[PDB]
């Protein structure tokens, strides 16, 4: 589970990037971790 604000986005690139734009979060790591 995540804190609210993040969408679970996945690209054909084979990698997932967790986006939360309050403060523009673009990250490889799950933000709950």
């Amino acid at each position: 589970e995540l804190p609210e604000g993040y969408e679970q986005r996945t690209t054909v690139q084979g990698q997932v990037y967790f986006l939360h734009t309050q403060t523009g979060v673009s990250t490889w790591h799950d933000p709950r971790i």
């Binding site: 986005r9 690209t11 690139q13 990698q15 990037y17 986006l19 734009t21 523009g24 673009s26 490889w28």
Partner: peptide, 10 residues
């Protein structure tokens, strides 16, 4: 399904 950033190769 709404992103502003480009995807990283790192």
């Amino acid at each position: 399904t709404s992103s502003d950033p480009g995807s990283p190769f790192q």
